[PDB]
Ligand SMILES: O=C[C@H](O)CO
């Protein structure tokens with residue numbers, strides 16, 4: 001039995017800015033392989049870095065001020081007000097620093113997922129805004145790769161029982177071993193699982209959609225291919 | 232939540248401050264050691280802080296997107312790293328409780344009555360008040376192993392057709408039954 | 419020196435920023451892609467920063483009270 | 491023509507405005523008081539207005555349908 005389907009990325013993530021600024025450098029090769037947590041961009045941190053330190057200086061000051069008054073009020077050398085106001089400022093500073101720190105951190109646009117980044121929709125030197133609609137880039141885990149197969153709800157059961165009645169080659173709980181046949185006609189050398197748990201159902205058709213998972217090193221398989229699973 | 236968490240704490244700091252200010256100034260005006268203005272203003276700020284904090288708290292909370300129902304989630308319409316907006320048109324994902332599963336049956340208003348009386352006249356196998364036991368037959372032809380209730384209380388009526396729609400309830404562990412199947416209930 | 423040290427770095431951070439700003443705007447003005455009033459201001463900030471830094475540096479330095487003479 | 495007449499004057503009002511705006515920004519770029527890009531946007535609007543007015547004028551004129559040929 002041959003089940004028609006489309007290959008899809010195993011995982012998709014969008015790269016976006018979370019701080020305002022100018023793209024200083026784009027540290028990645030379009031179309032290369034990037035790891036999750038890897039810096040993909042550098043937003044000119046000249047200022048954020050400046051504010052952050054400007055802040056810490058402030059906190060260092062107000063903090064001393066406060067700690068000194070805490071001591072003094074205990075001996076009434078100072079009033080309950082002055083200490084209150086002093087500890088007030090101290091708290092505000094401490095807050096500012098934390099916000100400064102957060103923004104500086106967002107200056108290094110990291111990759112959320114491990115996969116394959118394509119073209120960078122943003123040129124170096126460009127202006128980037130937190131909340132902006134468009135994404136700077138898109139990474140894609142392409143190794144284990146999906147193959148979305150759609151069968152009429154009936155067939156999914158039929159297969160499901162053959163799986164339990166040993167009539168199908170086990171591949172794991174709810175998974176049968178399968179082979180892939182490119183629209184090329186050729187036979188993808190490796191083979192993978194065909195999980196039976198449903199992922200979606202077009203109630204307007206009643207048909208179900210399940211996923212096959214093939215190993216894809218060498219990156220021979222790419223999203224969008226019209227293939228055929230085999231049981 | 233890096234920031235929401237930051238604003239929330241930034242806020243709580245403030246409240247802690249203004250609250251002290253108030254509770255104190257509430258005592259000085261008490262002995263005319265501070266004008267009515269000074270205290271009114273102090274309690275003003277205090278109330279504002281208290282409000283700010285509550286709003287910060289609410290936003291932080293929404294940071295963790297929970298599932299409203301228990302059931303089966305399908306694909307996630309949103310990728311990680313994506314930008315999400317309150318009020319946005321599209322839903323991030325849809326959960327569907329498929330275990331007890333419904334089977335919408337449509338019979339002409341007449342038939343519904345015919346069956347309703349057989350139910351009362353014991354001519355139909357009771358399954359509960361207003362419910363008769365029923366079996367399911369997939370469009371496959373096969374016979375769904377389990378069986379369930381066929382509630383007679385109407386759910387909707389296409390007045391343009393006069394026909395009524397009632398629901399059958401089948402157990403569906405194993406998740407063999409899925410939405411959209413064209414089946415047949417049997418009595 | 420906890421603070422002086424902090425102000426001093428707080429400062430240098432600032433200068434590093436305004437300095438970049440200035441050096442860049444001067445390029446723009448040369449293409450008339452920014453009013454010289456914008457540049458003037460940019461270089462104005464740069465000079466203030468540069469001044470701040472120097473004063474910061476001076477104060478930090480005075481943080482280690484040294485002995486003027488050799489003796490007892 | 492109640493409206494076409496209104497739109498035509500509504501427009502001319504606009505043009506009179508943006509035109510002044512432009513002519514003034516034109517003296518600024520001359521003294522590097524503004525960027526080329528600014529005088530650009532200003533002159534951009536000015537040209538759009540001038541176009542709008544001409545279209546308004548044309549339409550108002552057609553409010554008076556005329557005969558293409560001499561005949562019966
Ligand atoms: O931008 C999406 C792909 O990475 C490239 O073209």
Ligand SMILES: O=C[C@H](O)CO
Nearest residue numbers: 199200305306307325
């Ligand atoms: O929500 C059901 C499917 O997973 C998607 O669209």
